[PDB]
Design a binder for this molecule. Structure first.
Ligand code: NAD
Ligand code: NAD
Ligand code: NAD
Ligand code: NAD
Lengths: 330, 334, 330, 330
């Protein structure tokens, strides 16, 4: 059993925690945030997006008891103080959004942890891994990134399309749910001015490196994709809209067949396939990081096509964070 | 001296009246068999999206009175039964979404309409997009025209500029679109569009558009070279097109930006606008332009493969264009 | 087993259906609406508020196969044409919103059903029944109403408060989720002008007969309660805000104790009790028709107090419709 | 003219700034926040709730130029360092939410300003003034509070109802728009757990001091009113739901006539009156701090009634901040 500590009990930290309860290979033994245990318990117990926690949570002696399992609670701002080895933590899920370089993430190892999974794209050259794309490329590195939710949606789809038909070039839009970085009303975001505008009132353009990052986890695609985002007033679930030019001519039906074969084969559990008349809420709780929407896509011609793929940005990504933890521990 | 009649006092009909008031275009009558004069006063006076009507709205003797101007109210189901004759045979803005074809819309002509503008795509009526192909209007042969869709009015002016300067080889469009009256508050029945029945405020909803294809009708060189789709999202007004196109001539993003600016400052003033600000959708609520190019939201992969972004107030921007078109059509009477 | 036909496969119809799958005393044998079987299957399978249907749904020969069992699908606009007898229907859940008088609802008995439960307040003198208030007053009547969702929340609470302390007078507000009667953008609602305004944009004052109706199920409270509603931009879950004047002086701790005792006692499964820091999404899927929110309420003094009680207007009400169906079939 | 400086260019800061441009007695000469001039220009020009700024805004060199007028922009975290006198500021609108005691707010006076209006209820003994309630009780104090948006709504109404009929006791609910203190998705709010929950997903119960604070501005009502709030997914505009017991019997027609008379009389511009079928967006931009909704209210009897009053929590309050600025410097 791999012992894990979560740093940052936010959306990802809490959905990772819930995804881990269902696994036999992983145990959450410690959580760090900036909160009291009782508050931590409340945040686990109740979720606006994913419903109430399925099981028992209690607080005793300043720590959590989840389904009879004791969990260490700490409130250290500085990862260096976390004393991970005092709870026997093998891997830390780094989910604060603050520590996305080797120098910052490494503090966890300093604090006694063996390895670190960043729950976001690395801001330096920390290697990124996306299940279905390049888990097999992992080389025992002690600090890794699971990339972004969007790359996790795009990469597995882009690979299938590339392997079968060859992507000449592609432009991506993700229509993306509201997240924690955003604001309830027009407020300060000097980093990202559009991002400060009231989340529930607006369609909000956003820049993203997710399409570019696909070139990192699939180097055959380096320089061939880029894109952007629109943030919209939904609480969860997002969608990739991929416009690609193909080397080999392919009917939309042949594309569907290729994606389906991969969903049932090599990409199973990663890439999903549907032909139903689905909308975003139909993927709330979805574990697959990319679900191809066959009816939504459109071809201009045999070589120019718009492809649509859904992802629960919280649940899919959180599950693959756990997959990455398992994989680097093998 | 144009006189207008409005059929259907909905989002488009009410805001078409608003724009008419703003421009001094005389609306002589409104027909809507589902809204009585008193109820019309209420619906026009208060607007969740565009604010209270800035002026006065009263009912008097079965008439709608706006800024002291009396508007006859009709309550007829059928276009051919509306007494357009009794109010001086106006141009008719057909904004019900029910009478779309030349044949259906021509019912207004029978009862005295001089011309009809369908505030939507039509299976057969000529599409006219201000700034793009309005000169296509032939008063000698066209009594029923279409002002196209809101999305087409966004996409076409941009497409024209890009195609003329650089050549569009092919393009695929997405519009991220505000919800409308055809949608549902909670999952409900939409027999002809299952996704469109799902709760409008809970969901991103993939949706079909013919706007990108319709651009190939108003710009014939682009026929067969564009298609696309839509996502309906939980906003009440304002939409955005996201156009991914391959260009024939190499074009830096600076060249693209300069072409749009020039068109915006010159021949497409009031239709196509250009911004470099960090805007969001609410920044265009109440904007009169058909298309506001968002220079900083767009992205190029190379000099031939670019994603362009343009905003549009699908309600009020489109209503401005309905009014612009009827005024243009009136200017063409022989 | 009790054989049920559902007329109107809407929010209530479909949630009644789901809730019936978890009961052994009740089986749905037929569904009527104005829709093809394949669309009905889709509407059942996917739900924006309550997620994917737990189980199997397929269309076979123009009928539904749900968890292995064949459900007849019809599309008759006139209930009298329903041939409920052909599928041996015992009770019709009348959930269209269109047939809320004896005269209209009786068309189902004409069509071969034995009894009818209106899933809304009756517009005539058709008796209303609210679990925890007056189910035991049912007197073999063939057509009944399950009242409104709000009365189902208010009555149980009001009975507990009145039985213990004596309500002198009370005024109620319900802050209520958006429903199917509302409009996405400002549109025509000639019977209720406010109700036509964009549901997601507005707080919308609305009229309710729910507080008066409490007087009908609990005659001792007749003329003692009235109220109204605000409709707000949430898709489900509503809350009662009850301001009562008490005959007998009662501390808030005593009010808490009385509600808790009824929740664990004679009103178990109807009235619930919480002291947690809950919000509306925490009751999405709630079966209890009235969940007392201990920390949200506030007393001015021992005789003047504001009580808060949550309800899932869809799920709570739907479960109680089935409860009423089972009760009248005893 | 009265020279004004704004501390905190947030929702209130910015909306105060907009309302000041319409006034001949008041000129804003300086603003302080943690923002660059260009960003401040951006935040002023574009507003999700209130639309584009009616006027010109430029950053020249330089140098915030609004409507031809130079505005000093500073970025001092600490109010003591402000140097208000250097630009000749008489009064400071203190709109950060951080400096709501005499101790903290007095830093503006030591920084060269003459007086301070806090744009929220004071956390100490700093006197509060509500226009239409107790402006005339101002006695030359150098630091005052304009109370809260909700108090500004309830106080004027309470006064009219109390003056005419005698309020024995009342309980208030505000159904309130989301604000800057809330979160887009379930996030940390350690002092208010409920208020951390996804703003756009939930009806969120909330404590309030607004009804008790009425007893401060109208001492005759001390200990006679309390209440609470429900935060709902609207970006702006809130409504007061006041349940009152009256000493002197009053028909609803006499209540209406009394409110209308005060609205046309001594409380003109403060208290409004409507009989239209209004909803919340109809008051977006409303200058009156309390608009009585005649049709929405309901009476159980001549002594027990529920009254409904609207307020634009942003605009109404901001206008009254300026009215208080004007009053204290008369
Ligand atoms: N939400 C998504 O859809 C999503 C998906 C994939 C990846 N991510 C990434 O995961 C990361 C976290 O995202 P999130 O949405 O969970 O954000 P979040 O705001 O919900 O969570 C951040 C959490 O970290 C806590 N925190 C802040 N400072 C801390 C510190 N110094 N030490 C310990 N805890 C601290 C906060 O209290 C909060 O609970 C980011 O890198 C984000 O980009 C988010
Ligand atoms: N809303 C938009 O963003 C938008 C933009 C551009 C074009 N349009 C098009 O304009 C048309 C109207 O759209 P809308 O949003 O105003 O819809 P809407 O539902 O708001 O208005 C339709 C109106 O037509 C009335 N009506 C129905 N039948 C009628 C008849 N028999 N005679 C007279 N009136 C009748 C209804 O009472 C209603 O008021 C549609 O074709 C739509 O596709 C809509
Ligand atoms: N939604 C709630 O919170 C709630 C709660 C309690 C009670 N109710 C009541 O239940 C009833 C229905 O409510 P709802 O929210 O499900 O509405 P809904 O609009 O979701 O459902 C109505 C359904 O009936 C169908 N229908 C219309 N005419 C029909 C006909 N003649 N024959 C058969 N089907 C027809 C419609 O297609 C639709 O599917 C109403 O009386 C309502 O007041 C609703
Ligand atoms: N928005 C409302 O409905 C409302 C109504 C009445 C009163 N108020 C009160 O007004 C105050 C502000 O509310 P708001 O809604 O404008 O919040 P806000 O978050 O929109 O504004 C706060 C602003 O203060 C700035 N700020 C933070 N620290 C600062 C510092 N020390 N120095 C200078 N600026 C700093 C922030 O950058 C932000 O721009 C609060 O006391 C609030 O309770 C709000």
């Amino acid at each position: 059993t791999i012992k894990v500590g979560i740093n940052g009990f936010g959306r990802i930290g809490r959905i990772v925690f819930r995804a881990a309860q269902k696994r036999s290979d992983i145990e959450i033994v410690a959580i760090n945030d900036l909160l009291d245990a009782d508050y931590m318990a409340y945040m686990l117990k109740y979720d606006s997006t994913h419903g109430r926690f399925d099981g028992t949570v209690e607080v005793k002696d300043g720590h959590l008891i989840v389904n009879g399992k004791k969990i260490r609670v700490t409130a250290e701002r500085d990862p260096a103080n976390l004393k991970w080895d005092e709870v026997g933590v093998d891997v830390v899920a780094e989910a604060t959004g603050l520590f996305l370089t080797d120098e910052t993430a490494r503090k966890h190892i300093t604090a006694g942890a063996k390895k670190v999974v960043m729950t976001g794209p690395s801001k330096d050259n920390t290697p990124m891994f996306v299940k279905g794309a390049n888990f097999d490329k992992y080389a025992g590195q002690d600090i890794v990134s699971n990339a972004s939710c969007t790359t996790n949606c795009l990469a597995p789809l882009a690979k299938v399309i590339n392997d079968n038909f060859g992507i000449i070039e592609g432009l991506m839009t993700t229509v993306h749910a509201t997240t924690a970085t955003q604001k309830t009303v027009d407020g300060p975001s000097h980093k990202d001015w559009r991002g400060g505008r009231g989340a529930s009132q607006n369609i909000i353009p956003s820049s993203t490196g997710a399409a570019k990052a696909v070139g990192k986890v699939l180097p055959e695609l380096n320089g061939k994709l880029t894109g952007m985002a629109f943030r919209v007033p939904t609480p969860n679930v997002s969608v990739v809209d991929l416009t690609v030019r193909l080397e080999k001519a392919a009917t939309y039906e042949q594309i569907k067949a290729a994606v389906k074969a991969a969903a049932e084969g090599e990409m199973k559990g990663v890439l999903g396939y549907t032909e139903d008349d689905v909308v975003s809420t139909d993927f709330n709780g979805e574990v697959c990081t990319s679900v191809f929407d066959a009816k939504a896509g459109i071809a201009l011609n045999d070589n120019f096509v718009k492809l649509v793929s859904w992802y629960d940005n919280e649940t899919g990504y959180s599950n693959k964070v756990l997959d990455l933890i398992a994989h680097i521990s093998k | 001296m144009v006189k207008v009649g409005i059929n259907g006092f909905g989002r488009i009909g009410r805001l078409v009246l608003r724009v008419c008031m703003e421009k001094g275009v005389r609306v002589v009558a409104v027909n809507d068999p589902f809204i009585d004069p008193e109820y019309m006063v209420y619906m026009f006076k208060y607007d969740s999206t565009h604010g209270r009507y800035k002026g006065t709205v009263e009912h008097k003797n079965g008439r709608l009175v706006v800024d002291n101007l009396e508007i006859n109210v009709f309550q007829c189901k059928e276009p051919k039964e509306i007494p357009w004759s009794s109010v001086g045979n106006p141009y008719v803005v057909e904004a019900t979404g029910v009478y779309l074809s030349i044949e259906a819309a021509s019912g207004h002509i029978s009862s005295g309409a001089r011309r009809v503008i369908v505030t939507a795509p039509s299976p057969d009526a000529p599409m006219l997009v201000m700034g793009v192909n309005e000169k296509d209007y032939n008063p000698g042969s066209m009594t029923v025209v279409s002002n196209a869709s809101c999305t087409t009015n966004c996409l076409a002016p941009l497409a024209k500029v890009i195609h003329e300067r650089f050549g569009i080889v092919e393009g695929l469009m997405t519009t991220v679109h505000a919800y409308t009256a055809t949608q549902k508050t909670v999952d409900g029945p939409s027999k002809k569009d299952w996704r469109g029945g799902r709760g409008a405020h809970q969901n991103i909803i993939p949706s079909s558009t013919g706007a990108a294809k319709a651009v190939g009708k108003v710009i014939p060189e682009l026929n067969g070279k564009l298609t696309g789709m839509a996502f309906r999202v939980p906003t009440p007004n304002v939409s955005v097109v996201d156009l991914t196109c391959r260009l024939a001539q190499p074009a830096s993003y600076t060249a693209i930006k300069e072409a749009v600016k020039a068109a915006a400052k010159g021949p497409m003033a009031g239709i196509l606008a250009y911004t470099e600000d960090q805007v969001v959708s609410t920044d265009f609520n109440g904007d009169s332009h058909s298309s506001i190019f968002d220079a900083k939201a767009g992205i190029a992969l190379n000099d031939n493969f670019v994603k362009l972004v343009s905003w549009y107030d699908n309600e009020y921007g489109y209503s401005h264009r309905v009014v612009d078109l009827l005024r243009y059509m009136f200017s063409r009477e022989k």
